[PDB]
């Protein structure tokens, strides 16, 4: 494609996990607003797709058209289920096709999560606390993360998350970050803070982690090794 | 998204902080194909300034364009002024006042830096270890970070820093992270790792924070060998 | 040279650091009554400087003060030019020129900083503790030291510093000192103190160090044998 770009935003793992609907959206920008702007979807093999449900009524430039999508199940996402968005308009001499396939993730690596509590220095400020859920040692990309508190998915306005960047050990490994701001007192009590990470490489695509003052480094050690010359069983 | 697209560039402070040299360059992606360019560099005061040079005639797009560098004084450029070049075109006067200068003013805040050590699980696995450097609560953006081991600047490949992102508390606040890989053996009784941070809203333009094995807290064991 | 000094001297590392703007002064006096006398700053490019200020006459020490000054950026000051100041006087129609320069070569070594905590006998008596930021094995000279607590610096009103002295067992290497005094309870609350060592021969021209009571806390044990 050279003239008149065509966007194509496939469904991310977040919607597959939370929304549970794989919708492939494709649109055309910087184009005229007349009729004949038909957006369709079909498989490269020749098979079509489900009806384009939940169309977009308004448009950025009031482009009179109908975005093409398909409420296909997750089965059309693994490796060998490609798609093609076809767009037709009177301005162009022929319709434009946009083919899309799966990245075909390779060199699967079980994510290795290593959480650690907030830095000591913040505690001296006594103004606010921040928690990290850095994730590393995983492949492929597209790892989702969320901050739960007793089964309360926190809103994105509360926690932020970063995309994954290549790891320095090898290019077949990525790492990402996700922070969440809270009050210092709330962190003091623990409040059953948990981090949920979803990745395809995981056997169940869900892994939960948690941290507390005890987890980091308890200075005290009230160790009591009872010699108990003779107990045999649990004395 | 509609023309005049600028490709991703490294406007970070390291552009001049690694080599300690003022560099001035401004261009637009996919420029109109024309012979030469109407170079023009002047300050906002009114007096002209030495124009850039060293035009490297090499592009992947094969589009006839020009790109170079200009070194200027530091007082004027860092005078709280967003220096913008004024390079125009031969076919038509098009002064591209692109702000290659960093955003001075707006709001200054100390970038709080915390240097956190690897988790117990990572070290116990005895395969590698990662040290984290969190930078939080600062303004404006574009805060640079680097690593050192007692004057031994480790290769950029070893560590990696995220580009700045906005903070959930408010847009003014930002935060960034820098991770460094290293073997566990050195983290036990090896060398100290220092995470230096550079920002315009700093007194010396740079700070530093070191960590080593004892970075935690002193353990106070209370063993009680109760016997018969 | 303070009294009778017809030369020009540049600001030192501390002056450039505090002002953040490299300058250069030319003092010429105690030779004859200097009234309404001109001053020029011939640089390598041969361009007189502007922005002249802080000029007064009728000095109480029986003379006339007409010290000239220039303000530039470090792009050229480090380049190692030969800046000159010229003064033509009535009794001396000949141009009284004074050229200066900077060292274009010298051995540079990282400043080995070591922050030593208060002595046990220094604070055992419930008195003002003292903290010393020893710095040694470094060169060239003129290292600026300033103390920083929490997130702000402290003026010499509270601390003091020494000048460089040559090293005893390290030719070509100098060392300095700097003490910050503190109250007893203030130190006992841990707090945060850090000596900042501005020196050119540094990876980034600036370093820092911190040592407080928590630093010297080796692993502790409390055994209890019971039988
Ligand atoms: C607060 C306190 O009393 N702690 C001690 C503890 O350190 C010790 O290990 C234990 C043995 O009897 O006795 C108790
Ligand atoms: C450092 C520490 O806690 N040492 C403990 C002490 O606290 C406790 O009183 C004693 C038994 O009376 O055993 C020992």
């Amino acid at each position: 494609d050279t003239a008149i770009r065509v966007f194509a935003i496939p469904p991310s793992f977040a919607s597959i996990f939370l929304t549970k609907s794989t919708k492939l959206t494709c649109l055309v920008t910087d184009l005229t607003t007349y009729d004949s702007v038909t957006i369709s979807w079909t498989r490269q093999n020749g098979e079509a797709v489900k009806t384009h449900t939940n169309i977009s009524e308004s448009h950025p430039n009031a482009t009179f058209s109908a975005v093409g999508e398909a409420s296909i199940c997750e089965d059309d996402w693994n490796s060998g289920e490609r798609f093609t968005c076809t767009v037709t308009h009177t301005d162009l001499p022929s319709p434009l096709k946009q083919t899309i396939s799966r990245p075909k993730g390779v060199a699967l690596h079980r994510p290795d999560v290593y959480l650690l509590p907030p830095a000591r220095e913040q505690l001296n400020l006594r103004e606010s606390a921040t928690i990290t859920c850095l994730v590393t040692g995983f492949s492929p990309a597209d790892v989702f993360v969320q901050w739960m508190q007793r089964g309360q998915p926190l809103s994105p306005e509360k926690y932020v998350t970063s995309a994954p960047m290549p790891e320095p050990q090898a290019p077949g490994r990525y790492f990402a970050h996700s922070i969440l701001t809270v009050s210092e007192e709330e962190w003091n009590t623990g409040e059953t803070y948990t981090c949920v990470v979803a990745h395809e490489a995981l056997p169940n695509r869900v892994t939960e982690r948690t941290v507390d003052k005890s987890t980091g480094k308890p200075t005290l050690y009230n160790v009591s090794l009872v010699m108990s010359d003779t107990a045999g069983t649990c004395y």
Side-chain angles (χ1 to χ4, degrees), chain A:
Chain A
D1 46 352
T2 321
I4 303 112
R5 63 232 191 189
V6 185
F7 298 128
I9 292 154
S12 309
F13 197 98
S15 295
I16 290 144
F17 158 67
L18 183 127
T19 320
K20 190 75 223 78
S21 278
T22 53
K23 247 85 173 193
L24 302 144
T25 50
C26 64
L27 215 80
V28 189
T29 173
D30 301 78
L31 83 178
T32 58
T33 63
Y34 333 104
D35 91 322
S36 208
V37 190
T38 318
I39 317 306
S40 182
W41 277 91
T42 181
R43 236 175 298 175
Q44 208 76 70
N45 313 120
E47 295 84 313
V49 294
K50 297 169 175 179
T51 58
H52 309 335
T53 54
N54 314 83
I55 64 104
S56 302
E57 294 184 27
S58 61
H59 268 270
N61 325 297
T63 50
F64 171 70
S65 171
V67 65
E69 59 262 49
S71 197
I72 69 198
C73 315
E74 56 262 39
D75 180 63
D76 315 277
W77 197 241
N78 161 46
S79 282
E81 303 86 344
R82 66 211 67 75
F83 312 96
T84 43
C85 168
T86 310
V87 310
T88 172
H89 196 21
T90 187
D91 64 353
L92 276 146
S94 285
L96 256 71
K97 288 216 301 201
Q98 193 182 13
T99 193
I100 43 158
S101 78
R102 278 280 287 169
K104 306 160 277 291
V106 68
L108 206 84
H109 280 298
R110 61 195 175 284
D112 319 88
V113 170
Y114 305 92
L115 257 72
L116 77 180
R120 180 60 170 74
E121 277 66 342
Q122 296 164 12
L123 267 286
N124 325 76
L125 293 162
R126 305 186 146 69
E127 85 305 352
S128 294
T130 185
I131 314 98
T132 169
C133 183
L134 68 103
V135 305
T136 167
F138 76 100
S139 301
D142 201 327
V143 64
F144 173 78
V145 189
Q146 221 189 9
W147 290 85
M148 334 313 286
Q149 194 206 135
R150 310 154 294 163
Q152 280 284 13
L154 299 171
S155 151
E157 64 92 358
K158 310 179 190 169
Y159 77 98
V160 189
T161 305
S162 99
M165 309 55 60
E167 277 182 12
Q169 200 81 288
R173 290 209 182 190
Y174 303 159
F175 71 102
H177 291 63
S178 187
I179 314 324
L180 165 53
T181 188
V182 289
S183 297
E184 185 141 309
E185 182 284 336
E186 298 165 24
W187 178 93
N188 272 29
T189 51
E191 304 303 324
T192 321
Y193 283 10
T194 55
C195 184
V196 71
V197 56
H199 189 223
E200 296 172 2
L202 273 157
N204 45 13
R205 316 213 293 285
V206 168
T207 312
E208 206 70 49
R209 280 289 199 287
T210 195
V211 279
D212 203 76
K213 300 174 163 164
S214 57
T215 68
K217 192 254 151 190
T219 319
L220 201 133
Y221 285 112
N222 188 346
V223 193
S224 308
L225 203 152
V226 176
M227 214 37 202
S228 186
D229 276 88
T230 184
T233 64
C234 192
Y235 198 67

